[PDB]
Design a protein around this ligand. Structure first.
Ligand SMILES: Nc1ncnc2c1ncn2[C@@H]1O[C@H](COP(=O)(O)CP(=O)(O)OP(=O)(O)O)[C@@H](O)[C@H]1O
Ligand SMILES: [Cl-]
Length: 451
């Protein structure tokens, strides 16, 4: 049961100082920082109000932090000749990648890209893909990765939701997506567009569904908030990450930016889906130091490609409930391997919580999802939005720096899931309703139960 879906006493619409809208049950106290803009009304009536009024999701003390491309730029200045990307037998240095992305960024500016502009990127995995998305960020826009493994009808639909007036693609992919002004990625100082951390960096669309497109629109701050100042993996110039996760959803960022923001190497896997045998070969070839793997992929590699973990420093299972026996076996086979369980919705960006595996876990029936990343929060709430007592079952709501702005072109859906945070201080903040059931145990660690 959930009071944002079914509530006895009807609903109201709340807004904060940044013009963001939240659905809210009428019988529950209004959180600090929020004011009633509409209602009491029926749920459908509240949602209609939101659809009509909330026409721009972007929010309307100086912002802390550099943007994603700015941190990349500093790494490119620090070590222009360090290797940034590896793909098949080819390598691309930080310096060369920065120069290519600059050339393309200047082209984007001439075509009208500005802060607040979105740009579709329809490219197979390889250097051009990274040149293109960095170029979009540098020009101050947000990118949306259009994964070419998907049917064009679905890609076209997603692109339409974003409203992007520009598409970057390749000569071989030319003509698949039509009706949007298109430029070609095939090939230079840094730009200074005034873009900031609350500006949109990306819109993500899931690789794992055939339902109606849902574009998660997230600011630079949500990316940097997930990869900087964290300790769930090793970050630094001596790391070698492997970009094998689907390019258009949220696991992509850790692999690509977790490397580029730090001066590390990023190996790009050929093919749009994680390829277990190729992963094993790439780890051996390049000395990959961190793997991020969905649980099913993790379990297969542990059982059938054990050499994929040789030399690897951190492996993190995610996306679905971890298999304790496979985590245990990984530990037996690779004693120096640090193991983690990473949890979260794309709406809160990459990992919202993380659990470092300890010996005492390896005999359990389930692996805990751990504690929130620095700057992020997780609540376990009952259907009155009251925290669950210790060990009691409740629903997970997540909050803090990873939160997306919402779902592009879908303000009603955004307002029913990104809702007011009733625990936050004077400033109004939001929390995202995950739909996941969990328990918090005495020591504060979170246990995923399911849906
Ligand atoms: N480490 C982990 N352990 C268990 N479950 C996990 C997990 N990491 C992710 N999940 C599950 O996978 C989900 C990932 O969230 P998302 O990718 O945002 C789902 P979505 O595509 O937005 O669709 P939905 O929320 O409408 O189902 C989590 O909500 C959780 O159910
Ligand atoms: Cl150098």
């Amino acid at each position: 049961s959930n009071p944002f879906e079914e509530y006895d006493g009807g609903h109201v619409v709340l807004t904060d100082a940044l013009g963001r809208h939240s659905l809210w049950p009428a019988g529950i106290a209004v959180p600090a920082g929020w004011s009633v803009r509409h209602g009491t009304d029926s749920r459908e009536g509240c949602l209609a109000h939101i659809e009509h009024h909330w026409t721009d999701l972007r929010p309307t003390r100086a912002p802390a932090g550099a943007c994603v491309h700015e941190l990349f730029e500093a790494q490119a200045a620090r070590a222009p000749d360090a290797v940034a990307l590896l793909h098949e037998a080819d390598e691309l240095t930080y310096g060369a990648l920065n120069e290519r992305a600059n050339r393309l960024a200047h082209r984007l500016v001439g075509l009208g890209v500005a802060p607040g502009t979105l740009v579709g990127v329809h490219l197979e995995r390889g250097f051009d893909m990274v040149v293109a998305l960095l170029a979009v960020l540098k020009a101050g826009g947000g990118y949306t990765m259009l994964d070419p493994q998907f049917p064009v009808e679905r890609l076209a639909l997603s692109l339409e939701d974003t409203g992007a007036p520009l598409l970057v693609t390749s000569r071989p992919l030319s003509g698949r997506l039509t009706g949007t002004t298109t430029l070609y990625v095939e090939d230079a100082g840094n730009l200074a567009t005034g873009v900031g951390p609350e500006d949109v960096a990306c819109v993500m669309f899931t690789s794992g569904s055939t339902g109606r497109p849902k574009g998660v629109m997230s600011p630079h701050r949500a990316l940097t908030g997930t990869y900087l100042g964290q300790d769930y993996a090793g970050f630094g110039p001596d790391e070698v990450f492997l970009q094998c996760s689907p390019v258009s959803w949220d696991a992509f960022g850790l692999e690509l930016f977790g490397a580029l923001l730090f001066g590390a190497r990023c190996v790009l896997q050929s093919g749009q889906n994680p390829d277990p045998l190729e992963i094993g070969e790439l780890v051996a070839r390049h000395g990959v130091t961190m793997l991020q793997l969905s649980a099913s992929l993790f379990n297969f590699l542990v059982d059938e490609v054990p050499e994929a973990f040789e030399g690897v420093r951190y492996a993190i299972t995610g996306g679905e409930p971890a298999s304790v026996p496979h985590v245990a076996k990984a530990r037996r086979d690779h004693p120096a391997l640090r193991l983690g369980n990473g949890y979260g919705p794309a709406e809160s960006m990459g990992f919202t919580t993380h659990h470092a595996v300890v010996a005492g876990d390896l005999s359990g029936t389930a692996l805990p999802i751990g504690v929130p990343l620095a700057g992020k929060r997780a609540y376990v709430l009952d259907d009155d939005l009251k925290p669950a007592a210790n060990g009691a079952l409740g629903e997970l709501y997540v909050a803090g720096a990873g939160l997306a702005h919402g779902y592009v072109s879908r303000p009603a859906l955004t307002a029913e899931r990104f809702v007011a945070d009733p625990f936050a201080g004077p400033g109004g903040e939001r929390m995202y309703r995950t739909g996941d059931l969990a328990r918090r145990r005495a020591d504060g660690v979170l246990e995923y139960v399911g849906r």
